[PDB]
Swiss-Prot record:
This is Ephrin type-B receptor 4. The gene is EPHB4. Changing P205L: In CMAVM2; uncertain significance. GO terms for cellular component: cytosol; extracellular exosome; extracellular region; plasma membrane; receptor complex. Heterotetramer upon binding of the ligand. The heterotetramer is composed of an ephrin dimer and a receptor dimer. Oligomerization is probably required to induce biological responses. Interacts with RASA1; the interaction depends on EPHB4 tyrosine-phosphorylation. The active site is at D137 (proton acceptor). Phosphorylated; autophosphorylation is stimulated by EFNB2. Its main location: membrane. Changing P205T: In CMAVM2; uncertain significance.
Amino acid sequence: REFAKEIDVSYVKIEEVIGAGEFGEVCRGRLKAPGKKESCVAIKTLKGGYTERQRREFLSEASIMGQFEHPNIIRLEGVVTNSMPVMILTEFMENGALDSFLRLNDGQFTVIQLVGMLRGIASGMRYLAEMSYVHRDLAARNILVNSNLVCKVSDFGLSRFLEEGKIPIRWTAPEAIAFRKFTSASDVWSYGIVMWEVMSFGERPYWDMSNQDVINAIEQDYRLPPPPDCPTSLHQLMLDCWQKDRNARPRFPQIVSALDKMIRNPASLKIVAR
Ligand SMILES: Cn1ncc2c(N)nc(-c3cccnc3)nc21
């Protein structure tokens, strides 16, 4: 009902539309509140004719995001709910979604930069797992990137999938597909997919395979191969995330530690397949 970051609409200047989201436009804007310096924000607006259900679904993202505070989790800067249009303001992420940012920059960041991106994502997920929050839709298209290449987890919501939007099959652990048991360990499977997306500069997981083909292949022991030039130690970490037995997967603290070791010992990334 009441949001801790409700903000006066006169503190918001909406500037250009920069994207399209689930419920409407996403805009760049400026937030200037009394006693505070002006900051850049992204602004999601809910416009026109919408159900009350849609309004609650839209605002639920702000409710959840506002529970979190971490450098690798998108920060909620405020909401406008006492007036129309309804708005969610977040920190602005100059480079947008990670998957499209990497496709635009194919081959143009080094392995150590890519590992730093993956470390930031893993740190955000380490925090969510410690908060007992299961993301369920962890994918490169849900990671946002700032000007300094800091990656932050976005897309928050506790609504059930249609089977319980649809389950994102290509990112989802097999026990979550089969039994609808979503845990931080299923999040780890998804994180392995994100690693593959990052090291492939935004290629689509499983290329042209259908959803049922992916489900069957995973059950039949297929796993995505190392992306071109991918250090074998990073592919092995992906394979660890993709263990069928959820209890055998590394947990997020382990994943962060493994990436931190690579950053400290970059020579360990030189080994590549073939
Ligand atoms: C560029 N930027 N900066 C922050 C931000 C956000 N929270 N959400 C989105 C967003 C969300 C959904 C669809 N398109 C863009 N973009 C953002």
